Amino acid sequence: AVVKCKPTSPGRRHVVKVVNPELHKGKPFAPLLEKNSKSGGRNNNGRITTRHIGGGHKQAYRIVDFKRNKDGIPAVVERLEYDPNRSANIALVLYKDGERRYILAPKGLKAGDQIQSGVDAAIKPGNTLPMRNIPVGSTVHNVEMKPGKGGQLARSAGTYVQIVARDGAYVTLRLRSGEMRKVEADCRATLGEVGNAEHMLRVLGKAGAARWRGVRPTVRGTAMNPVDHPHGGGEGRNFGKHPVTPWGVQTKGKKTRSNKRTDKFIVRRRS
């Protein structure tokens, strides 16, 4: 659950940990791992294209199945595991034919449970169906947007998508952001919310904790010189400007979405 640390040092006073007794303690499944080196925010030109990224603990990549297309073969959950690469927990499932895969662990899924994908699967958490067959009002996760492409929506811990209507070839979803969207009825969705809903309750407690996750310090613009940021300069603390990004674009309210290719699928903006 959520555990408060004892204030035995200044850096511990505010730490809140999220501890799961049911996660595996051993090493992960070796055949489903590969390296991923860190970028530091640098692109192939070598330049910082995203600031505030660097360092952190080494991690290995767990190949997760977002497609779930081993159709019609029941599988049993072996163990829940810790994944460095995401907020959610992953679950190691064993297929009846001897194949092992990692999937996003939904809420309430424990070891020994039975999951299955396909058009004929039952309505149970962890089961994957084309959204044609899922009743309206169901809450799914790991939702696809193009058939056969892989789930892309509602993948972070505690997130899910509401199926609010089906009309012909399209189903209407309600995303966590509050946006109503249309997707083709043949895209697949996994039933139930994704687990580890306490992830948002953690408190890092100290600066080093954020440095462990690869986050570097953020320098305020108003603390720079004019040559470095539109906010720089001043004798003392001076602002007298409309807030903007480091590149001069207004940054409190100005909308930046510009994609006409996709405006047809948006029913309502997140408001």
Partner RNA sequence: AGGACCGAACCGACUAAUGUUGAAAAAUUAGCGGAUGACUUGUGGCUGGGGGUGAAAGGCCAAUCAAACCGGGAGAUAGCU
Partner RNA sequence: GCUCGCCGGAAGACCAAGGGUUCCUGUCCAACGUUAAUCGGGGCAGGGUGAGUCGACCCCUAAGGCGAGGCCGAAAGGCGUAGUCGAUGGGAAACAGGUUAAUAUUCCUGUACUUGGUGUUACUGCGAAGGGGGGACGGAGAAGGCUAUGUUGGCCGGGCGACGGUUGUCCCGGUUUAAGCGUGUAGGCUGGUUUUCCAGGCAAAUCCGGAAAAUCAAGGCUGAGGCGUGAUGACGAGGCACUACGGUGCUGAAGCAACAAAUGCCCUGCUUCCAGGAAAAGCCUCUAAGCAUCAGGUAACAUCAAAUCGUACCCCAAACCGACACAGGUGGUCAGGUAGAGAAUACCAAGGCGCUUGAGAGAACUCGGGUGAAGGAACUAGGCAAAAUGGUGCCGUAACUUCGGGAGAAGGCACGCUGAUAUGUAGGUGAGGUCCCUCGCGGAUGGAGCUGAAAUCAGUCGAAGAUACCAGCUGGCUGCAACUGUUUAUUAAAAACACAGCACUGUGCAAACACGAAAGUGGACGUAUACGGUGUGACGCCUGCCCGGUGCCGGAAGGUUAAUU
DSSP 8-state code for residue 53 = B
Task: Count the Cβ atoms, other than its own, within 10 Å of residue 49.
Answer: 12
Q: Applying CB under 7 A, does 32 fall inside the site for RNA?
A: no
Query: Which of 180, 154, 178 shows the shortest CA–CA distance to 165?
Result: 180
Residues contacting RNA: total by CB under 7 A:
132
Residue in 2, 22, 85, 114 binding RNA, rule: CB under 7 A: 85
Bridge partners of 182, per DSSP, are 172
Q: Does 69 bind RNA (CB under 7 A)?
A: no
Of residues 201 through 230, those in contact with RNA by CB under 7 A are 202-213, 215-229
Q: Which stretch binds RNA (CB under 7 A): 13-21, 126-134, 163-171, 184-192?
A: 13-21
- 159 near RNA, judged by CB under 7 A: yes
Decide if 15 contacts 206 (C-beta within 8 A).
Answer: yes
Residue 196 beta carbon to RNA: minimum distance, rounded to whole angstroms: 7
Q: Does 267 bind RNA (CB under 7 A)?
A: no
Closest separation in Å from C-beta 91 to RNA: 14
Q: Which does 264 bind (CB under 5 to 8 A by kind): Mg ion, RNA, none?
A: none
**Contact flag: residue 268 with RNA (CB under 7 A):** no
Nearer to Mg ion, 22 or 228 (CB): 228
User: Measured from the CB of residue 92, what is the shortest distance to RNA in angstroms?
Assistant: 11
Q: How far is the CB of 256 from RNA (least distance, A)?
A: 3
User: Any residues with CB less than 8 A from the CB of 21 and at least 6 apart, and which?
Assistant: none
Nearest 10 degrees: Cα torsion 215, 217, 218, 221 = -160
**Nearest-CA neighbor of 102 among 114, 112, 90, 119?**
90
Q: For the chain, where are the alpha helices, taking DSSP H only?
A: 207-212
According to CB under 7 A, which one of 69, 82, 110, 123 is a site residue for RNA? 82
Burial category of 72 from C-beta neighbours within 10 Å (exposed 0-12, middle 13-18, buried 19 and up) = exposed
Shortest CB 134 distance to RNA, Å: 18
Element (H, E) at 114: strand 114-115
Using rule CB under 7 A, residue 237 touches RNA = yes
Residue 261, contacted partner among RNA, Mg ion, none, CB below 5-8 A by kind: RNA
Partner that binds at residue 135, options RNA, Mg ion, none, CB closer than 5 to 8 Å by kind: none
Least Å distance, CB 127 to RNA, is 15
Q: Which of RNA, Mg ion, none has residue 236 at its interface (CB below 5 to 8 Å by kind)?
A: Mg ion
Q: Which of 10, 7, 20, 8 is nearest to 202 (CA)?
A: 20
Considering only CA atoms, which of 134, 188, 126, 186 is closest in space to residue 163?
134
